[PDB]
């Protein structure tokens, strides 16, 4: 395994400010480190940061950084559905909604790109699709979308579609559900998906559409109709 420091190679650079240097956002830099570790160790299954003691590294981050860092574990365990759960279970039951959402997304990522008859992604992420916590909704929706991208699974699509129209769904959750549906139905021209997205777009007001998160609905339609 390669830790982020190996990639960074700070000692080579001229350490002009090795002492009281610029005070950068430590939480943001920890998030960057988590992303870098995930990318560098992707698909290998071993990692020198989360595997040895993952709770310390996770709690080193702040707020959503915990969600991203937790998902990094699934990124690392990519294509290892069998081994993904036995490692992500520890974080699947956590006192932090961010960590639990990250574990959901990690399971989705782990299942992404491979297909089993056990449908682990559905089995695990169908529970939190409509949960009252928007963060967990986001994690589960994105995990399911990544796990079943390009599959055109009617069961998953019918599970996901009501989320867009559900009342207690922020614009973020609506856009993420549109993205997930587009990924699941890419190159399918699904009547259900297109009708749902069009209805959702029409239902909202000008002030709500001024939000940037709303840009993910036209993206969902385009992904559905790609090519």
């Amino acid at each position: 395994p390669k830790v982020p420091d190996d990639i960074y190679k700070t000692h080579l650079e001229n350490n002009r400010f090795g002492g009281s240097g610029s005070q950068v956002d430590s939480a943001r830099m920890n998030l960057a480190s988590s992303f870098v570790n995930g990318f560098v160790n992707a698909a290998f299954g071993q990692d020198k940061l989360l595997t040895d003691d993952g709770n310390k590294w996770l709690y080193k981050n702040k707020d959503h950084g915990m969600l991203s860092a937790a998902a990094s574990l699934g990124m690392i365990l990519l294509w290892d559905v069998d081994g993904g759960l036995t490692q992500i279970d520890k974080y699947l039951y956590s006192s932090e909604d961010y960590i639990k959402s990250g574990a959901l997304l990690a399971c989705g990522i782990v299942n992404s790109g491979v297909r089993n008859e056990c449908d682990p992604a559905l089995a695990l992420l169908s529970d939190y699709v409509l949960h009252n916590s928007n963060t967990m909704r986001l994690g589960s929706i994105f995990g399911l979308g990544l796990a079943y991208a390009g599959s055109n699974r009617e069961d998953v699509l019918t599970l996901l579609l009501p989320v867009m129209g559900d009342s207690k769904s922020s614009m973020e959750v609506a856009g993420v559900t549109a993205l997930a549906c587009g990924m699941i139905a890419v190159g399918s021209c699904n009547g259900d998906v297109t009708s749902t997205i069009l209805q959702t777009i029409m239902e909202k007001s000008e002030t709500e559409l001024k939000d940037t998160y709303a840009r993910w609905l036209p993206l969902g339609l385009g992904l559905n109709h790609l090519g």
Partner: protein
Amino acid sequence: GDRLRQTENRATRCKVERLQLLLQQKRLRRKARRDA
């Protein structure tokens, strides 16, 4: 709140255990087929 979270945790535990069992069965079946 807390009760709902505990119930969700129990449900996820049960689902994970069932999943690991099914995956172990699938792995051993694949190994048996490959040996055959």
